[PDB]
Design an enzyme around this catalytic site. Sequence first.
Site, PDB file in Angstrom:
ATOM      1  N   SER A 271     -23.929 -10.063   6.999  1.00 42.08           N
ATOM      2  CA  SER A 271     -25.021 -10.663   6.212  1.00 42.08           C
ATOM      3  C   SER A 271     -24.553 -11.586   5.075  1.00 42.08           C
ATOM      4  CB  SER A 271     -25.905  -9.554   5.639  1.00 42.08           C
ATOM      5  OG  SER A 271     -25.373  -9.012   4.455  1.00 42.08           O
TER       6      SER A 271
ATOM      7  N   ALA B 158     -12.964  -6.933  -0.860  1.00 41.17           N
ATOM      8  CA  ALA B 158     -13.751  -5.726  -0.600  1.00 41.17           C
ATOM      9  C   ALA B 158     -12.959  -4.710   0.225  1.00 41.17           C
ATOM     10  CB  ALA B 158     -15.012  -6.100   0.151  1.00 41.17           C
TER      11      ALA B 158
ATOM     12  N   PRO C 116     -12.507  -1.530   2.974  1.00 42.01           N
ATOM     13  CA  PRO C 116     -11.041  -1.588   3.201  1.00 42.01           C
ATOM     14  C   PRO C 116     -10.590  -3.007   3.485  1.00 42.01           C
ATOM     15  CG  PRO C 116     -12.118  -0.732   5.104  1.00 42.01           C
ATOM     16  CD  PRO C 116     -13.194  -0.898   4.096  1.00 42.01           C
TER      17      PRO C 116
ATOM     18  N   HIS D  35      11.017  -7.486  -9.161  1.00 45.06           N
ATOM     19  CA  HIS D  35      10.612  -8.013  -7.881  1.00 45.06           C
ATOM     20  C   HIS D  35      10.666  -6.887  -6.845  1.00 45.06           C
ATOM     21  CE1 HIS D  35      11.267 -11.726 -10.015  1.00 45.06           C
ATOM     22  NE2 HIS D  35      12.390 -11.173 -10.424  1.00 45.06           N
TER      23      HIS D  35
ATOM     24  N   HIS E  27      -3.290  -1.802   2.680  1.00 40.95           N
ATOM     25  CA  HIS E  27      -3.626  -1.330   1.326  1.00 40.95           C
ATOM     26  C   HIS E  27      -4.390  -0.033   1.497  1.00 40.95           C
ATOM     27  CE1 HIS E  27      -5.188  -1.490  -2.842  1.00 40.95           C
ATOM     28  NE2 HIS E  27      -6.413  -1.382  -2.370  1.00 40.95           N
TER      29      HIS E  27
END
Lengths: 315, 294, 315, 294
Positions: B89, B107, B109, B156, B163
């Site tokens: 949507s 957003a 997952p 680093h 994620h």
Amino acid sequence: SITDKDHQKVILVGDGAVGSSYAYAMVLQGIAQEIGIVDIFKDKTKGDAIDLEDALPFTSPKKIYSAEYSDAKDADLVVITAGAPQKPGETRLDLVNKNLKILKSIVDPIVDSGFNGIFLVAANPVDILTYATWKLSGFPKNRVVGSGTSLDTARFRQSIAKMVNVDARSVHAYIMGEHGDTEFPVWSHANIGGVTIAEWVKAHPEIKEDKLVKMFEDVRNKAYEIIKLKGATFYGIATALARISKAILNDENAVLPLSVYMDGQYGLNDIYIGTPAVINRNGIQNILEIPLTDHEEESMQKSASQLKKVLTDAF
Amino acid sequence: SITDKDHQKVILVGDGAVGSSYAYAMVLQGIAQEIGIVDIFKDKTKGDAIDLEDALPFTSPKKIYSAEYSDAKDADLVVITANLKILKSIVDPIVDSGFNGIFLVAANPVDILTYATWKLSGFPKNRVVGSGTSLDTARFRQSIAKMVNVDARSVHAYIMGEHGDTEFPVWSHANIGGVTIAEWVKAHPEIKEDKLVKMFEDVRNKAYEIIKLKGATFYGIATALARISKAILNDENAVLPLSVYMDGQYGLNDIYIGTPAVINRNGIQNILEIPLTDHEEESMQKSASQLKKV
Amino acid sequence: SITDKDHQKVILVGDGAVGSSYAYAMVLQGIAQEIGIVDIFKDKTKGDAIDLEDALPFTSPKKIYSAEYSDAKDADLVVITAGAPQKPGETRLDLVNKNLKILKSIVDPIVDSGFNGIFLVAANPVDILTYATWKLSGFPKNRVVGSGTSLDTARFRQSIAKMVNVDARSVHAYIMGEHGDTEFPVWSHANIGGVTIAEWVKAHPEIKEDKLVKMFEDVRNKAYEIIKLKGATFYGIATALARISKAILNDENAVLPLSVYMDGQYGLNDIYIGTPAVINRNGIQNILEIPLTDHEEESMQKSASQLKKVLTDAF
Amino acid sequence: SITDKDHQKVILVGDGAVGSSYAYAMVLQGIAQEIGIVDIFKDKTKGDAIDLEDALPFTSPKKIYSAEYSDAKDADLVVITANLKILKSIVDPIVDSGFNGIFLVAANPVDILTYATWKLSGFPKNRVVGSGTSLDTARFRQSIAKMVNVDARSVHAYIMGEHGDTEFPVWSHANIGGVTIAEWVKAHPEIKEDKLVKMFEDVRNKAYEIIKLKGATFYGIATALARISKAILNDENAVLPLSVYMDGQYGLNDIYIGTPAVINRNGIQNILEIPLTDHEEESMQKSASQLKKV
């Protein structure tokens, strides 16, 4: 109020193209609140100060003026730029000795003013003059800092960046040793976004060993190339000086390749020489000792040895 | 004039804490010249836009307003923070507007929704980007920076994979000013292996800890989104860990997953394939497997 | 080294949406090196501190932590944000008195820590609480500063900017008085790039007097509008606080509309109230006394009078 | 992708002290992504480009190179610092390249050469801009700022007219935080009228003083050029004093002269006509007259 100290003051000694360009970099980036510019050529320093002041309405405010050594009394930072150039046929030792006299005539009145900050030395030969500033000033080792190979390291990063088309801020590679002909690349720990150069070349075999060797040679000769083309180098070193100044004045604990005092690192002692180090408002905190390959360590030993010999003869 | 194009426009979808905070970051750092804020709660988006506008006299100017999907017609960037049927949507009307820039998906997952945004939109792979492990990587860098008292900008280290719970640290290539973590521990043996293990576990659970303490996380991800936005809009060719499309890298295909990549005005330019240890590669394979199955 | 002082430390009291958003603004703009966040809700402050720390690798480094009043000992700046809200049917005097108790419980332990910097007060009602912070702390007038009408002035500038399509940084117009319902616009000296509003309206007669009057009304009611729409206001004031913080910590001698102590200006005495002032590392230097029209001066007198009456009853 | 346009390109013509310093300013402030440097002395431009590139690891990335007029094809901005027959030899090949952005003219005599660039180029009036009295105005602001010990960013005062000996100060509208100079002197009577006169005379002679002291002026104008460049490239609608085309303003026509103007990505948007006193208007008329005659 404790916030009577929130006024950062830099005294610049030497208003050649390096010093002038540095002052301009500090103006445009809004670093420090006061710059006094000291040079034997007083007219030039006044001229520069007032030209620089005209930039101020488009950046953050500063006091900028033609200064004297006594103005260092309450300075945070004394930045020493303008070394006497080597004359055709003059020895390196003679270059050192004539610079020592001059440097003595700067450092002694600065110290006598009551200055109690950090010395940032960019005058050539930089590692030698950093050591000499330490000897003359009496200051602690960690408050006499030389620009060292910070510029060569930037040149090296930008050259790799251009070859691979990546922001140089994502490239991480050092040149170390004495800034000058004996400096060397630290290929073993050089990387692009964490991927070592050795790993990158495996993935991208069009990159030939001969091209990497040449890239380092071109970095080592870069000042000679720029001087041949436009007479003098200045934007590189002015920028590197402003970056070091910011690391100090904003207490960053940033890692930069600087000229720092050897107390055993790389098997070296009692010289200033170029290596990564952490720097903050109190000067050099940790000295990073990169584990070098045998070839890299030998380059470091050779760079240091010739440097140490010159210091020994000089003092 | 060609200079008529020197106007960068962002459409933000989702004005919760994350989206609001991202808009604030863009304002304060002077990134882009126009931000339209799209959310179902129209009163809130208006309230945010006018609160934000009040910051503009102390920064560079922008147009900021409550927006609709149709405003994406000439946007550079659509940032999705607003959750699977909801995404269709959003993406369909954005595409239908004529939008032809880069999608930045945050957003959760994220790796899944980045893929989904690619499928729904029909856009090229390199122009659908997810925030991926950019935030976990920042958490990891800052946690190392604190342990050693060094600016994180000189640390680093990467977290990679999906994620979420199957992400992993790339210790083999992690370093502080070029000195690998293995090398640093040898020089500084007060740092115990167990602390490093814990450090990564704390990074992996950090969102949960923040949620527990104040209810929601938002400053971290907002800041990471703004940084990615700057890399695109200033054409940087910066290396950032992002959710990018696998075409063979790490032995993976046809998923979006976290790895370092070069990003510029045209989106993803190169995907960096870090040579992982066997243990790190297995972690990558396991993270990807479970993700691919979903 | 004198450069052991080049570490700027801010203690924030109140970690509501204003305080939190302020801390974020200071992180993103790289202002100061240390933020301690103090609030009764300790969990929230820890949560905020660690969420904020995750931003640090994309900006300049800081120490950020959940703090206590004793951490103000060596702070440059104590920023007081979170006033107890007025309850339905509570008098203004009651609002003042409940805030005075709380403010006493903040200011006394801060002073007792040895804090010796500048107080920046944003808690509502701000002019009253700036005065109260001055009375409680014992500090000099010029080191207790309130945000005053800095935000209303920004709102006013941005509203004019939008009407005329000009960067608000090129618009110069003040709202003055007590921040709240009695504040007023200083149309007589308002201008766009030096062209007064009166002059601009002559050149552009489509701009009707009725629209300018409404623009000011909308500014005065803007907080009510934002609160009605999203529940609370915060980005405006956080930004204005960060701007004031920068003026202090970078010693700018910037002109900002702040809450400052009246010693005769506008025919006023012994209150804090909103007017342009020069601010630097030592706090308020000059207070600018804009020559007001009779109508503007009467607005200033009315704003001040009601404010002074409340202070008198309160102390 | 529409984002392929998010790459801002400047061509600088003239690599003397002014042009070099301007390039340095653009580098340090992260303005634009590409700078080509064009000058007859090719070795120098190469030397400058590579010296400048060495600053890039401490700032945001750019492409910087020694350039030719043909490289202006897709530039946003052509900045002319390099002088009447010389200008035709610059503008014609720049136009012939297909250049279709904004000309920013700083070469002296600037108001004349801005007009000349408009005539030679055939570009619209609003897309040929001169630095005009932006630098004299900065000098004036800083000189007031020093006298009163206030940030110059809080001082608002203009020098207008032709940049050069006939320029004049607009004291009637000059102010410090909204307090007019006439009002400030009443509150601070240690400031004598004679000092204000001298201040303006010193602003008018400032280039001569700087030249006398160090041989050439460059930091002031470089900085002003960078500021103008940022106003264009970030679409600011900033008010700056610039050389702009007179179409009735101040009773003037068909010359470029210094006055405040709004500038954005499309060049000049509005010319501000400050209501001058009779004395200030005569100064404007005299400055314009002599200019128009030339």
